[PDB]
Design an enzyme around this catalytic site. Structure first.
Site, PDB file in Angstrom:
ATOM      1  N   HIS A 168     105.075  73.638 -18.980  1.00 61.87           N
ATOM      2  CA  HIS A 168     105.757  74.719 -19.671  1.00 61.87           C
ATOM      3  C   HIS A 168     105.646  75.252 -20.271  1.00 61.87           C
ATOM      4  CE1 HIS A 168     106.012  75.557 -15.487  1.00 61.87           C
ATOM      5  NE2 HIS A 168     105.631  76.033 -15.345  1.00 61.87           N
ATOM      6  N   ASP A 197      97.385  81.647 -14.089  1.00 59.23           N
ATOM      7  CA  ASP A 197      98.890  81.019 -14.075  1.00 59.23           C
ATOM      8  C   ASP A 197      98.566  79.445 -13.390  1.00 59.23           C
ATOM      9  OD1 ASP A 197     101.592  81.026 -15.201  1.00 59.23           O
ATOM     10  OD2 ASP A 197     102.747  81.040 -13.308  1.00 59.23           O
ATOM     11  N   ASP A 218     105.254  82.689 -20.165  1.00 62.44           N
ATOM     12  CA  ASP A 218     106.626  81.428 -20.121  1.00 62.44           C
ATOM     13  C   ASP A 218     107.518  81.083 -21.712  1.00 62.44           C
ATOM     14  OD1 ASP A 218     106.061  80.251 -17.270  1.00 62.44           O
ATOM     15  OD2 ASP A 218     104.663  79.403 -17.774  1.00 62.44           O
TER      16      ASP A 218
HETATM   17 MG   LIG Z   1     106.342  80.927 -15.264  1.00 62.87          MG
HETATM   18 ZN   LIG Z   2     102.939  79.611 -16.291  1.00 65.83          ZN
END
Ligand SMILES: [Mg+2]
Ligand SMILES: [Zn+2]
Ligand SMILES: O=C(NCc1cccs1)c1ccc2nccnc2c1
Length: 313
Positions: free
Chosen positions: A68, A217, A107
């Site tokens: 992330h 994503d 994120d």
């Molecule tokens: Mg996320």
């Molecule tokens: Zn993400």
């Protein structure tokens, strides 16, 4: 005004493809992102002094976590770029602006832990935001960075266009909460089949933008197998850290997150492709046919995981 970004030939061609990997050269990623905003949006969308300062502050606020991280930000921005470029007239000027910024910021400040771990840890963010905890944080961090002197890349927008772009970005970042994907996709599947889907209906666009955000994503599952397989490592590096932190709270984590149960990874990947990835890109291809390559690559990677199970790799 006359200052374009140019990529080397191979990047210049491959970047237009859904399965483009942004590569291991961190110092090229801001250029890649700006290239995509200039092609997706125009050389005119953002003051380049401010865009550069926004990008480097967003990069600063991603952490050195296995998955992330900054590279995930830019990878997710690239997938949104491929969808926008393959659907050139379905999206407003405001949506193309907002959605690439949404992806880069989606994120922001991730610590590498699920919402579920924040709740069980009793993290302060969990008190502040009862659902979509990390995602309400990522939106909050985006608004914080946009407010730094010299960073308001939307400054040249009217009052109403500004409020609309921040609403697009909020909904888009909230939609990256996988817990909201399942409901959203079902509603989109029904609306499509019963024939009620209407892209002039804001509530409908919002939902379609949510699906895009999930699709971007998860876009790790839509890469050529060596990228998918090597990204899965980083994803599972995080899951296992969290499993370890669960065991420290005296909670046996789910198998997916237990590093003791690596053997079960291939089967867990099958379920994930079956329960999440394939349905997501199927529904997205139905609403936006030109995104078929994402569904194709995903089907291809499912088969690779099936081959891993059958001991063939
Ligand atoms: Mg996320
Ligand atoms: Zn993400
Ligand atoms: O989030 C994951 N699993 C838990 C949940 C699934 C659905 C709702 S909550 C997951 C699992 C496997 C993956 N492989 C690749 C990319 N992304 C992945 C993400």
């Amino acid at each position: 005004g006359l200052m374009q970004f140019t990529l080397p030939v191979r990047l210049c061609k491959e970047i237009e493809l859904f399965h483009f990997d942004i590569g291991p050269f961190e110092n090229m990623w801001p250029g890649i992102f700006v290239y995509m905003v200039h092609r997706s949006c125009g050389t005119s969308c953002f003051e380049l002094e401010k865009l550069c300062r926004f990008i480097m502050s967003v990069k600063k606020n991603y952490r050195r976590v296995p998955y992330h991280n900054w590279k995930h930000a830019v990878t997710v921005a690239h997938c949104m770029y491929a969808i926008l470029q393959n659907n050139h007239t379905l999206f407003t000027d405001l949506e193309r602006k907002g959605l690439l910024i949404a992806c880069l910021c989606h994120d922001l400040d991730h610590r590498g832990f699920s919402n579920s771990y924040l709740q069980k840890f009793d993290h302060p963010l969990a008190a502040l935001y009862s659902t979509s905890t990390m995602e309400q944080h990522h939106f909050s961090q985006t608004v914080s960075i946009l407010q730094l002197e010299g960073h308001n890349i939307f400054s040249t927008l009217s009052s109403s266009e500004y409020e609309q772009v921040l609403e697009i970005i909020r909904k888009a970042i909230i939609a990256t909460d996988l817990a909201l994907y399942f409901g959203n996709r079902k509603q989109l599947e029904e609306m499509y089949q019963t024939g009620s889907l209407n892209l002039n209906n804001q509530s409908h666009r919002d939902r379609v933008i949510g699906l895009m955000m999930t699709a971007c994503d998860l876009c790790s599952v839509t890469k050529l197998w060596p990228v998918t397989k090597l990204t899965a490592n980083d994803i599972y590096a995080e899951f296992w850290a969290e499993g370890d932190e669960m065991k420290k709270l005296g909670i046996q984590p789910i198998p997916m997150m237990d590093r003791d149960k690596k053997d079960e990874v291939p089967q867990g990947q099958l379920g994930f492709y079956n329960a999440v990835a394939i349905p997501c890109y199927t529904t997205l291809t139905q609403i936006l046919p030109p995104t078929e390559p994402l569904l194709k690559a995903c089907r291809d990677n499912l088969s690779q995981w099936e081959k891993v199970i059958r001991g063939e790799e």
